[PDB]
């Protein structure tokens, strides 16, 4: 099957304490807690969009304003049909290394953030790759991350 999203492990976000909800390309979010859906969409923006990362996290962006906890949102991707899926090629061309030969199908994209009290600005520390155990240093050539060449968020809101 073509490349598809698999899971996002949002932890200690604005309202998400610890949730691991599955995803698949075409996603629909609805129901109660409109603030919950807004926080989920902004979590995706933080994980994928550079226009939201640059503002960083605030005191309100954490769960119950508790700055001790660490934001950790981990997007999980499934890779298959390499020779025909253009988006798989797009994702795997930018990533150089950090992909273990044992599991070439799974691909994690995490986002670790710890709050410092000496500057009151939680830095967004992207740590993506293919295995949770071992992460190599992300290039991060200035403001534009290596992820910025793969995933661009087109935000639609009237």
């Amino acid at each position: 099957g073509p490349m598809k999203f698999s899971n996002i492990t949002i932890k200690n976000f604005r309202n998400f304490e610890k949730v691991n909800i599955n995803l698949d390309n075409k996603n629909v979010i609805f129901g109660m807690n409109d603030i919950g859906k807004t926080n989920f969409l902004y979590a995706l923006r933080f994980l994928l969009d550079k226009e939201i990362r640059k503002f960083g996290f605030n005191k309100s962006d954490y769960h119950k304003h508790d700055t001790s906890k660490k934001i950790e949102i981990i997007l999980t991707l499934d890779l298959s049909n390499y020779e025909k899926d253009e988006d798989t090629k797009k994702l795997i061309s930018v990533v150089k290394g950090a992909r273990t030969s044992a599991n070439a199908d799974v691909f994690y994209i995490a986002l670790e953030s710890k709050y410092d009290d000496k500057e009151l600005y939680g830095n967004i520390i992207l740590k993506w790759g293919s295995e949770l155990d071992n992460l190599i240093d992300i290039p991060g050539r200035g403001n534009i991350n290596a992820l910025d060449n793969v995933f661009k968020v087109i935000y639609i809101n009237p």
């Binding site: 390499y82 798989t88 795997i92 950090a98 992909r99 030969s101 190599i136």
Partner: protein
Amino acid sequence: MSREQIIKDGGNILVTAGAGSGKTTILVSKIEADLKENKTHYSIAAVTFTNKAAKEIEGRLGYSSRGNFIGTNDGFVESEIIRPFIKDAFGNDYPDNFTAEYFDNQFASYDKGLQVLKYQNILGTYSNPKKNFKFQLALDILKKSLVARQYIFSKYFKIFIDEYQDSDKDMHNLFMYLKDQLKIKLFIVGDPKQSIYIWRGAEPENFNGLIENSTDFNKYHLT
């Protein structure tokens, strides 16, 4: 008019250029045209031994958001194929960062070279001036790693090769492996009369055989 033939291109292109450079301007024109007509994430790789040639290629070309690599063959391999995937292909024990010094080992047996590379971290060359061990290592890391093959397939859709008469059997095998087993387009230019680096390790007879025996690479004559 040969300008129309240059513009129309089409797949792999082999040009029998003359001496006194000349290949540089057609290389720059081909690179610029390929970048202009392309509209996808596919990158390009142009490789040249001459360092100042790489410097002028970078200088006359603008900044590209998509990663385009300009460098030397050994630097190209040791930069993108060896350095990242050495831990993935051969386990975490193998070192990832290292420097190349040709005049350290001077061994005679392949097994001894393998042992000294694995243990003492030293990377050199054969006592035989012919052949380069770096491209054999690139073949080895490509063969048993699907990640490296996938990365090479997805990143570059056409790899530009310069002064191919200087190539020996090792990088010839690497380029043919990328062209056939990875279905990656190759743009190769070479001068039959530039066979002067033979003592350095160059054996262009394979290039001449591809000129004659092979049929996929169409031959073009440039005035």
